[PDB]
Design a protein around this motif. Sequence first.
Motif, PDB file in Angstrom:
ATOM      1  N   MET A   1      38.835  17.002  14.048  1.00 17.89           N
ATOM      2  CA  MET A   1      39.242  17.857  15.520  1.00 17.89           C
ATOM      3  C   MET A   1      38.040  17.509  16.133  1.00 17.89           C
ATOM      4  N   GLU A   2      36.475  17.791  14.995  1.00 22.80           N
ATOM      5  CA  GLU A   2      35.635  17.838  16.026  1.00 22.80           C
ATOM      6  C   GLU A   2      35.198  17.152  16.835  1.00 22.80           C
ATOM      7  N   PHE A   3      35.398  15.804  15.993  1.00 19.28           N
ATOM      8  CA  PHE A   3      35.111  14.431  17.728  1.00 19.28           C
ATOM      9  C   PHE A   3      36.243  13.720  18.082  1.00 19.28           C
ATOM     10  N   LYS A   4      37.370  14.645  17.228  1.00 18.46           N
ATOM     11  CA  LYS A   4      38.712  14.422  18.558  1.00 18.46           C
ATOM     12  C   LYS A   4      38.892  15.151  20.022  1.00 18.46           C
ATOM     13  N   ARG A   5      37.965  16.120  20.046  1.00 20.70           N
ATOM     14  CA  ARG A   5      37.918  16.185  21.847  1.00 20.70           C
ATOM     15  C   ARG A   5      36.157  16.185  21.802  1.00 20.70           C
ATOM     16  N   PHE A   6      35.252  15.745  20.637  1.00 19.55           N
ATOM     17  CA  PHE A   6      34.304  14.797  20.830  1.00 19.55           C
ATOM     18  C   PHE A   6      34.406  13.485  21.104  1.00 19.55           C
ATOM     19  N   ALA A   7      33.560  12.678  21.528  1.00 18.23           N
ATOM     20  CA  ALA A   7      33.634  11.005  21.301  1.00 18.23           C
ATOM     21  C   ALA A   7      34.587  10.485  19.955  1.00 18.23           C
TER      22      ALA A   7
ATOM     23  N   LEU B   1      24.513  10.919  15.219  1.00 16.39           N
ATOM     24  CA  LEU B   1      23.989  10.173  15.273  1.00 16.39           C
ATOM     25  C   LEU B   1      24.753   8.978  14.508  1.00 16.39           C
ATOM     26  N   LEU B   2      25.880   8.897  14.013  1.00 12.17           N
ATOM     27  CA  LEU B   2      27.276   8.343  13.724  1.00 12.17           C
ATOM     28  C   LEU B   2      27.211   7.727  15.022  1.00 12.17           C
ATOM     29  N   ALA B   3      27.781   8.146  15.818  1.00 14.35           N
ATOM     30  CA  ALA B   3      27.805   7.168  17.469  1.00 14.35           C
ATOM     31  C   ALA B   3      26.294   6.726  17.832  1.00 14.35           C
ATOM     32  N   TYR B   4      25.133   6.621  17.341  1.00 12.76           N
ATOM     33  CA  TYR B   4      24.312   6.213  17.958  1.00 12.76           C
ATOM     34  C   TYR B   4      24.222   5.080  17.550  1.00 12.76           C
ATOM     35  N   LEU B   5      24.323   5.448  15.853  1.00 11.68           N
ATOM     36  CA  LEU B   5      24.396   4.395  14.549  1.00 11.68           C
ATOM     37  C   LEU B   5      25.608   3.594  14.745  1.00 11.68           C
ATOM     38  N   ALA B   6      26.715   3.641  15.805  1.00 14.41           N
ATOM     39  CA  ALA B   6      27.550   2.711  15.802  1.00 14.41           C
ATOM     40  C   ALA B   6      27.717   1.833  16.822  1.00 14.41           C
ATOM     41  N   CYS B   7      26.371   2.606  18.092  1.00 14.41           N
ATOM     42  CA  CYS B   7      26.168   1.498  18.950  1.00 14.41           C
ATOM     43  C   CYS B   7      25.413   1.208  19.397  1.00 14.41           C
ATOM     44  N   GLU B   8      23.904   1.220  18.695  1.00 11.68           N
ATOM     45  CA  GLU B   8      22.577   0.302  19.034  1.00 11.68           C
ATOM     46  C   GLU B   8      22.810  -0.417  17.751  1.00 11.68           C
ATOM     47  N   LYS B   9      23.772  -0.408  16.661  1.00 13.60           N
ATOM     48  CA  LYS B   9      23.340  -1.468  15.854  1.00 13.60           C
ATOM     49  C   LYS B   9      25.253  -1.220  15.354  1.00 13.60           C
ATOM     50  N   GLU B  10      25.252  -2.756  14.836  1.00 17.34           N
ATOM     51  CA  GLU B  10      27.078  -3.362  15.005  1.00 17.34           C
ATOM     52  C   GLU B  10      27.551  -3.005  13.867  1.00 17.34           C
ATOM     53  N   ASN B  11      27.165  -1.782  12.560  1.00 15.54           N
ATOM     54  CA  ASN B  11      27.770  -1.402  11.972  1.00 15.54           C
ATOM     55  C   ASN B  11      27.990   0.205  12.023  1.00 15.54           C
TER      56      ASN B  11
END
Lengths: 49, 50
Positions: free
Chosen positions: A29-35, A1-11
């Motif tokens: 670590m959860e998004f260290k291995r992940f995005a 969800l946060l990645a989509y908010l950061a990609c689709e929107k410039e915020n």
Amino acid sequence: LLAYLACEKENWGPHLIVVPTSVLLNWEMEFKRFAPGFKVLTYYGSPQQ
Amino acid sequence: KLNILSLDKFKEQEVWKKENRLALQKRQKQKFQPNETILQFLSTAWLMTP
């Protein structure tokens, strides 16, 4: 969800993840291995650091 | 790229910890050296027949 908010929107301003203490490392670590395109901060460990 | 590198350094430091604890466990204290440079006697018992 946060990645989509950061990609689709410039915020991608400062967001907060309120979690129990035990998972405190796991989340950073959860998004260290992940995005990894985000800048993560971990808040703990005595007044000095 | 920096964060993936950080995860890789976490992996390498955890394997460093594993080898460090393996070396600590295997080091032991088998260094009594109860010999010195003195006159020592050796006795052996065996049955050879070639």
